[PDB]
């Protein structure tokens, strides 16, 4: 009993618009939210969780920091991007693990498209669990292949204290964790 | 090393604006990116552990409208901190008028963000406790805010990520990231 009626554009950029979006409440009654969709009209991305399997060591959550205009300053990410050109989320995911990280891994597990923000934008990603065989050479000394301008340090953290790391990451390095990274995190302490 | 040069306003919406943000990348070549803000951290998402003698620990989850996705999401309790509020107070102010549960604080993150590569939007993830077995969480009543519709879904936290595949392939709805995030690091654990 929820419904779109109308999207009015108010401001199209490049990659980015801001829409008037004008729908339905259960009262029957009308309303408005400004709402941001992309410029290219299947999910748009993929975040990987990638599990660094080592033998005789912790598993290790492998994540990303970069700088991010938007934040004003470096965050920490899970390995993450855009879905190209008719290209699986599957694959996305080892190659984006790939070209950011150096690693290359095994699919998992892979989520139904979720949303990003939806407070916000209509972004949707596919969440996809990968383990890492770090006792193969293929990861022996893994080499990131990141595209034009894109400037990315890995970070890998021990999964059994994960949470502890991401906070000390904060408290010392003044940047942000990423939400999903965080919920991740505290999940692992909260299944006890 | 990187940082902002300027930030330019594209457009100013009531409540969003876009903005065309440049910066010094690490080369040392400016570079621009489209960027989402509003007209501390912004908001709160509650997780809201339901514990109840003799039975399963649940998460608390609400079903909402989300216009910016044309349909219906599954989420964390969320609110936008008031001026002047704390992380806490608005977490625990906004899962009693999302859910009618009154829960204890547990714990609280640092602000954490939403969607980096799009808006500076930052959040607390604030973990909240609820005494089902207090007679004040037995029969809860949502309040929800002007213009706001919620149904609640609790689920047992030992089978979050399947009943969440089940929910998804039985109705026309979208979890969000973070609650999906959560739901697979139990089933790692
Ligand atoms: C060469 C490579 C490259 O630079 N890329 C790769 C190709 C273009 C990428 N891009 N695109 C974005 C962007 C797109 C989508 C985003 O979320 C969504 C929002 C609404 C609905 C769905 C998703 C967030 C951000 C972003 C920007 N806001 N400004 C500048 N550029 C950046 C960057
Ligand atoms: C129930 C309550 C209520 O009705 N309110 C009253 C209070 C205002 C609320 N509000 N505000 C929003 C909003 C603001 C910012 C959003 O993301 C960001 C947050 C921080 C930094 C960057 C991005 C997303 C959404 C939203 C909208 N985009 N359209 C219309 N109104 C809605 C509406
Ligand atoms: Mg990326
Ligand atoms: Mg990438
Ligand atoms: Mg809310
Ligand atoms: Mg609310």
């Known amino acids: 009993k929820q419904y779109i009626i ?3 554009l108010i401001s199209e950029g490049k990659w980015v618009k801001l829409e008037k979006t ?7 009654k009308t309303r408005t939210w400004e709402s941001v969709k992309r410029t290219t009209r299947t999910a748009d991305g993929v975040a990987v969780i990638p599990v660094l399997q080592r033998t005789l060591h912790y ?10 205009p938007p934040m004003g300053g470096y965050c920490i990410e899970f390995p993450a991007g855009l879905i190209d050109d008719g290209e699986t989320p599957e694959a996305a995911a080892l190659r984006e693990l790939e070209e950011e990280t150096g690693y290359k891994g095994d699919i998992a597990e892979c989520s139904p498209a979720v949303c990003m923000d939806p407070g916000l934008s209509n972004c949707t990603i ?7 065989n770090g ?8 080499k990131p292949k ?5 400037f990315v340090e890995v970070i890998s953290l021990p999964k059994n204290d994960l949470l502890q790391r991401l906070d000390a990451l904060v408290a010392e390095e003044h940047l942000t964790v990423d939400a ?7 999940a692992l302490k909260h299944a006890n």
């Open 126 to 132: 596919h969440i996809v669990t990968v383990t890492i």
């Open 135 to 142: 006792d193969d050479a293929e990861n022996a000394r893994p």
């Open 6 to 8: 109308s999207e009015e």
């Open 180 to 186: 999903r990274v965080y919920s991740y995190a505290l």
């Open 22 to 28: 004008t729908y339905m409440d259960p009262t029957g």
């Open 146 to 150: 990141p595209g034009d301008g894109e």
């Open 59 to 68: 598993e290790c959550i492998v994540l990303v920091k970069q700088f991010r």
